[PDB]
Amino acid sequence: MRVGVLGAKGKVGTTMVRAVAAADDLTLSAELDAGDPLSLLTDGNTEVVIDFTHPDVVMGNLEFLIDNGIHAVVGTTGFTAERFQQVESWLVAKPNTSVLIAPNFAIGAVLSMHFAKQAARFFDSAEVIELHHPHKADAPSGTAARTAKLIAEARKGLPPNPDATSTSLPGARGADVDGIPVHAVRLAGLVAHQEVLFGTEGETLTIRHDSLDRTSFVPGVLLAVRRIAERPGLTVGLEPLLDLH
Amino acid sequence: MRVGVLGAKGKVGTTMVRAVAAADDLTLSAELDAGDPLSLLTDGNTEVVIDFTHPDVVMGNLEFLIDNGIHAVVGTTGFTAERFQQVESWLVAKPNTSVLIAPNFAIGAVLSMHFAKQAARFFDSAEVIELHHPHKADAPSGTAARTAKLIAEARKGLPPNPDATSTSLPGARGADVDGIPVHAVRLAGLVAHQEVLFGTEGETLTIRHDSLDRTSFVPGVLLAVRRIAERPGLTVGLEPLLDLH
Amino acid sequence: MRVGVLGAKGKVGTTMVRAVAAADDLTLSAELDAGDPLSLLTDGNTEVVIDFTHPDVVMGNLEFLIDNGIHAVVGTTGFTAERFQQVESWLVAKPNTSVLIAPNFAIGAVLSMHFAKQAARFFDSAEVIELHHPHKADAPSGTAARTAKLIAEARKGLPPNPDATSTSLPGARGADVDGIPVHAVRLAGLVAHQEVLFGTEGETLTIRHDSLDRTSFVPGVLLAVRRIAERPGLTVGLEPLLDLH
Amino acid sequence: MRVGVLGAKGKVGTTMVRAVAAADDLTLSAELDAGDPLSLLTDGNTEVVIDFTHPDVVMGNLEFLIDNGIHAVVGTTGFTAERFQQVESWLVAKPNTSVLIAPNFAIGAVLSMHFAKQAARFFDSAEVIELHHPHKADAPSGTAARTAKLIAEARKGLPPNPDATSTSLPGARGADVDGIPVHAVRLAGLVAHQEVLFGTEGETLTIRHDSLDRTSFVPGVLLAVRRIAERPGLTVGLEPLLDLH
Ligand SMILES: NC(=O)C1=CN([C@@H]2O[C@H](COP(=O)(O)OP(=O)(O)OC[C@H]3O[C@@H](n4cnc5c(N)ncnc54)[C@H](O)[C@@H]3O)[C@@H](O)[C@H]2O)C=CC1
Ligand SMILES: NC(=O)C1=CN([C@@H]2O[C@H](COP(=O)(O)OP(=O)(O)OC[C@H]3O[C@@H](n4cnc5c(N)ncnc54)[C@H](O)[C@@H]3O)[C@@H](O)[C@H]2O)C=CC1
Ligand SMILES: NC(=O)C1=CN([C@@H]2O[C@H](COP(=O)(O)OP(=O)(O)OC[C@H]3O[C@@H](n4cnc5c(N)ncnc54)[C@H](O)[C@@H]3O)[C@@H](O)[C@H]2O)C=CC1
Ligand SMILES: NC(=O)C1=CN([C@@H]2O[C@H](COP(=O)(O)OP(=O)(O)OC[C@H]3O[C@@H](n4cnc5c(N)ncnc54)[C@H](O)[C@@H]3O)[C@@H](O)[C@H]2O)C=CC1
Ligand SMILES: O=C(O)c1cccc(C(=O)O)n1
Ligand SMILES: O=C(O)c1cccc(C(=O)O)n1
Ligand SMILES: O=C(O)c1cccc(C(=O)O)n1
Ligand SMILES: O=C(O)c1cccc(C(=O)O)n1
């Protein structure tokens, strides 16, 4: 299988390049970063692309890829409904082309979101603390926001988090994501971390995920790269490839 | 519903007394502690008993209760397979009597055991750190041991935790519970806490439960007290009620 | 020693009442809550008062107390420079009257602030996560804000926390306290908790303090109540009574 | 300054090689791993050596180095009183040779040991949880053991940790280090982590250090490499350099 990487010089992208290069069943056929022509892709007869670039360019790369029938495994963040729709649109005229977009490729993260969904209804309180390296441009993380969305949707019909806050400094209570507070920590020394906190009378549940290293994202990505053509169209999240094995 | 409490003066037992006393749909009909006659139960027309006493006396109280058709919600620890056995044969002669024994009545704890079951097969490593107040007689906790049992059974067919330990002080690596290391911390200021740690390449998943207070055990207990007669015979665990596992 | 309590029916105040009542060397001589006359104090010949009330009334109570020469141990939050000054003022015409105001009376909290002061200069990043029960009116806590102040002052002359945040939801990055981000979590089941996070290349230092119970504030308070008259005037913080024994 | 590295191919050693190579004021003059002659050191005019090898070979390398007047910055673990002894008598015959041995070169770790020293006397309980990658041969870590030693010495004259344990699985309570329990976790995905837990009535203090990456040990090592000759003879610990203790 001929695999190309968009964002090859990036913190994550370079890690994927080594991963592909080292995979016995994959041929690294393209290494693009900022300012490299996309035809390098079509030129090396790339079959699938791993994209870890930027919210400002991903839709550009996606149109090209789908246009040329190249499958895409996308980790780049910032996707929205309209974006998904756009993708969803684009892919309609391009059947047999698969695009997989995951807010996080680490298994612990995927499991965390799963568990949070399950625990949400049993508690009175839920907040999300997210912790990342100081080079991350967006806060809160997409993973954190998506996790707040899931908790909120799972608690439909229940009252809101109890909060007697009457005076506070702006921002102390974090960002409101569908009524779930989300706090973003940007600290040197960190990579990617998230804590989901549930509380009720006299007890709390914490689901914590820690990416100590960017290699943590490779198994998930390569798993997707390999079974990409199984589900043609648009897949979101890794869950579909996991709640099997 | 007439509810009696065994271990009424205990750290947990007294909390249950207040809880029952305050429940609008329950009548506190008995308060027994060490040295109180069991007939105080039968004497007050008790229908259900909450037992938070001691491993050395629970079987004694259980025989009496079943004998007199009183239902039992038991939180007292130290139950074993053989123990689970006597209570059954005791009930067969007293069908229509229900006994519920739960290693933990806090919801977060029950959910933690559920999640650990689900995550076990996705990681190379699993260890359990358990933390309790310095008055706890047994280590590791029953909750921790049961959680190690579940993780082990969920990983049947997979290799053991990788460990290159070649020299160590005795005990440094914790207790072996079905091949899952369990560490017991006994510290002033704590109540009841447990951490489940899963690890694989470059990432870890931690499910942490904290009982900051003994009130955390009341909802679970009262839930069981109320639906006790829904299942005649023995019920081990709170799972069946929480409609999950 | 005749001790009176302001805020006697409060979450913390009631705990202090039991504490005083149980102290063999203290006489509980007054129990005031909202709507009780202050002369109850002067009426019972109170010598020292413990105040755990509200930012809106503390200055009122303080004027009376100082006016009548009653010493005050104040845990109520929301004090400011002008307030301190005001107190500082007031106390000038009232020598031999001592007032002790502490942002936190738990020893671990006092130690945490001490340690943070010491570690601040060794790291590139510092953030503060504070976690409290959902009845707390103010965010961030006074302890958290004071801790951010100390870290900032200890890092004078060093560059700011590195942060590449370019897009973010409002509040995701917390409150800015002297350039130190502070995040406030309000969750059911919690009492009073704080985490100080320091980060540099490939490592982090976390100093975590947990008040699992409001009794945690009693030793500190009673220590202050007893040695109150040692330092006449205004003392802030418990440190002066600790960096001895 | 001509710097050589012993254990150049090791997890940590290779990281030091890159660090030296990249330092503008240091010349990488030697790269030895298992089976490389020590004369490669003397051969390249090496002035200082960084040793991250193995307890079984460090004394061998130390004799050679001191013998030839090469300074040594040693991170390799397993040093003991008797060991500390040979190196001294070796140096007496080679004054002007400096040897620095540190159980940990990460700053957060050094600070953690400092703080634990300070907090020890204020609590009733102290335990140490240490967490490392599954390739570590020794448990508990030297850092953890040294930290338990310090806490114990700081609590001389005080009673022991209160523990009502009466029945337990072997090892559940950890290793005894001078009466301080130490627990060693070996988990995939981890690098080097330690938690110090102090507890007293209703509260706990936790000092947590996390090395998410082996780069975390470079600043400390290079700092020592550079000022090595400031102190002829033996220096145990990084404390003397950090101007603290
Ligand atoms: N879904 C997941 O599991 C994960 C998602 N991410 C996300 O993936 C992205 C990458 O993060 P990092 O690697 O830390 O960023 P980075 O520091 O690597 O920045 C992105 C890289 O891609 C390059 N690139 C930029 N524009 C490009 C273009 N138009 N075409 C091709 N290459 C281009 C940039 O030059 C740079 O090399 C971010 O949005 C991040 O939040 C990161 C880790 C995991
Ligand atoms: N399943 C769960 O969720 C939980 C289980 N437990 C377990 O429940 C038990 C109680 O824990 P604590 O309250 O902390 O202990 P405790 O020692 O404070 O409470 C036990 C009390 O019951 C009394 N009692 C003893 N023998 C009795 C007898 N023959 N008849 C009536 N009362 C008797 C004792 O004098 C004492 O008052 C232990 O086995 C503990 O491990 C504790 C918390 C939660
Ligand atoms: N410094 C420290 O270590 C600590 C400080 N606090 C702070 O102390 C205060 C108390 O917190 P909680 O006990 O949770 O609040 P709370 O829920 O007890 O509210 C305060 C109580 O004082 C009463 N009171 C109100 N106005 C009064 C007045 N004018 N005169 C006399 N009594 C009055 C109220 O009726 C209520 O009983 C808050 O500002 C809290 O943040 C809380 C714990 C520790
Ligand atoms: N003080 C500190 O801050 C730290 C100390 N350490 C300790 O440093 C040592 C190294 O740890 P790792 O790098 O993880 O182990 P490792 O086994 O990955 O590194 C050791 C390496 O040195 C090689 N080597 C062995 N014998 C040698 C010899 N006679 N001459 C030259 N090279 C030789 C081995 O082949 C291997 O390449 C251990 O004792 C570890 O506990 C590790 C991290 C930090
Ligand atoms: O969901 C996210 O935004 C996310 C997840 C992991 C890592 C990163 C990152 O390094 O930016 N971002
Ligand atoms: O599983 C247990 O043994 C357990 C769980 C919660 C509390 C206690 C306890 O307080 O003894 N014991
Ligand atoms: O510094 C604070 O504001 C603080 C500290 C401990 C407890 C509380 C509280 O219960 O409000 N508030
Ligand atoms: O104190 C120790 O033994 C220690 C400290 C940090 C890392 C390692 C290691 O990687 O072996 N060992």
Name the DSSP letter for residue D230: G
Residues B7 and B61 in one domain: yes
Burial of C160 (0-12, 13-18, 19+ CB in 10 A): exposed
End-to-end CA distance of chain B: 28
- Per the annotation, where are the binding residues of C? 7-12, 33, 75-77, 102-105, 133, 142-143
Lookup: tokens for D152:
């114990």
Residue showing tokens 């145990």? D236
Cβ atoms of A28 and A17 closer than 8 Å: yes
Residues 6+ apart with CB under 8 A from B196: B112, B115, B116, B126, B128, B147, B151, B206, B207, B208
Q: Where are the alpha helices (DSSP H) in chain D?
A: 11-22, 39-43, 58-67, 81-92, 107-119, 142-154, 218-227
Edge-to-edge strands of the sheet including C71-74? C27-32, C2-6, C48-51, C71-74, C98-101, C233-236
Residue C167 and residue C132 in one domain: yes
Q: Could you tell me if the CB of A53 is within 6 A of ligand 5?
A: no
Looking at the structure, tell me whether residues B245 and B177 fall in a common domain.
Answer: no
Residues of C in contact with B187 (CB under 8 A): none
CA dist C226 and A143 (Å) reads 52
Q: Mind telling me how many Å the CA of A47 is from chain D's nearest CA?
A: 32
Cis peptide before A140 (omega within 30 of 0): yes
Structure token pair of residue D231: 């102190």
Exposed, middle or buried: residue D135 (CB in 10 Å: 0-12, 13-18, 19+)? exposed
How far is it, in rounded angstroms, from Cα C73 to Cα C99? 6
- Collapsing DSSP to helix, strand or coil, C202 comes out as coil
- Cα–Cα distance for residue pair A37/D213, rounded to 1 Å: 35
CATH code, domain carrying A13: 3.40.50.720
- The reply to whether C136 belongs to the active site is yes
Pairing mode of beta strands C192-200, C125-132:
antiparallel
Residue A212 gets the label, from left (phi > 0), alpha (psi -120 to 50) or beta, of alpha
Do C95 and C117 belong together in one domain?
A: no
Between the CA of C154 and the centroid of ligand 2 the distance, in Å, is 49
CA–CA separation, D26 and A57 (whole Å): 42
CA dihedral A164, A168, A173, A175 (to 10 degrees): 120
Residues A172 and A84 in one domain: no
SS3 D223: helix
Chains contacting chain B through 3 or more C-beta pairs under 8 A: A, C, D
- Cβ of A212 under 8 Å from any chain D Cβ? yes
User: Do strands C233-236 and D233-236 pair parallel, antiparallel, or not at all (unpaired)?
Assistant: unpaired
Check CB contact of A15 with chain D, cutoff 8 Å: no
Cα torsion through B90, B96, B102, B108, rounded to 10? 170
Distance B143 CA to ligand 6 centre (A): 7
* Dist. CA D109–CA D104, nearest whole Å: 7
Which residues have C-beta atoms less than 6 Å from ligand 6? B 77, 103-104, 132, 136, 138, 141-143, 192
For chain D, the distance separating the N- and C-terminal CA atoms, rounded to the nearest angstrom, is 28
Task: Report which residue type is found at B20.
Answer: V
CB B156 within 8 A of CB B167: no
Residue B94 annotated among the catalytic residues of the structure: no
Give the nearest partner residue to A199 out of C123, C138, C189, using CB atoms.
C189
Domain limits at D234? Answer: 1-105+213-245
Contact A125 C169 (CB under 8 A): no
Place of tokens 């393209």: A30
Helix H or strand E segment including A142: helix A142-154
Q: What is the CATH number of the domain that holds D196?
A: 3.30.360.10
Name, in order, each residue with C-beta under 8 angstroms of D210's C-beta and a sequence gap of 6 or more. A189, C203, C204, C205, C206, D108, D192, D193
Handedness of CA D149, D150, D153, D155 (dihedral sign): negative
Ligand sitting nearest the alpha carbon of D217 = 4
Contact assessment for residue D147 and residue D113, using Cβ atoms and an 8 Å cutoff? yes
Is there a single domain that holds both residue C66 and residue C148? no
- CB-based contact (8 Å) between B172 and chain D? yes
Distance of residue A233 Cα from the nearest chain C Cα, in angstroms: 30
Residues C9 and C99 in one domain: yes
What is the rounded CA–CA span in Å between residue B127 and residue C23?
A: 44
Cα–Cα distances in angstroms (integers) from residue A149 to residues A123, A242, C116, in the given order? 16, 21, 35
Measured distance between the N- and C-terminal CA atoms of chain C, rounded to whole angstroms: 22
Strand duo A175-177 + A180-186: pairing? antiparallel
CA-to-CA dists, residue B232 to B69, B99, D138, angstroms:
11, 8, 52
Please tell me which of the candidates A138, A162, A190 has its beta carbon nearest to residue C199. Answer: A190
Please, is A80 exposed, middle or buried when counting C-beta atoms within 10 Å of its C-beta (0-12, 13-18, 19+)? exposed
Examine the domain organization and report whether D142 and D158 are in the same domain: yes
Report the largest interatomic distance among the alpha carbons of chain C, rounded to a whole angstrom.
62
Please give the helix or strand (H or E) that residue C227 lies within, else none.
helix C218-227
CA dist B81 and B237 (Å) reads: 14
What's the total number of domains in chain C?
2
Handedness of CA A50, A52, A53, A55 (dihedral sign): positive
Helical packing angle, C218-227 and C11-22, nearest 10°: 60
CA distance A207 to chain B (A): 5
My answer on whether C199 and C123 are in the same domain is yes
Give yes or no: residues D5 and D98 share one domain: yes
**Quick one: which of B140, B150, B211, B151 has its CA closest to B182?**
B140
Ligand 8 atom closest to residue D141's alpha carbon, by position in its atom list: 3
CA distance C207 to D196: 10
CA-to-CA separations, C123 to B204, C119, D149, in angstroms, rounded: 25, 7, 26
3-class SS shares of chain A: helix, strand, coil, % to 5: 35, 25, 35
Please state, in angstroms and as integers, the Cα–Cα distance from residue B71 to each residue in B49, B107, B232, D142, following that order.
6, 22, 9, 54
User: Does C34 share its domain with C52?
Assistant: yes
What is the distance between the alpha carbons of residues D58 and D99, in angstroms, rounded to a whole number?
12
Best probe of the A interface among C147, C185, C190, by most A CBs < 10 A, is C185
For residues D206 and D226, membership in a common domain is answered with no
B195, C81, C108, D5, D160 from B185: Cα distances, Å: 11, 43, 19, 40, 15
Q: Which residue has the tokens 């980060």?
A: C199
Dihedral sign computed on CA atoms, order C228, C231, C234, C239: negative
* DSSP at C215: G
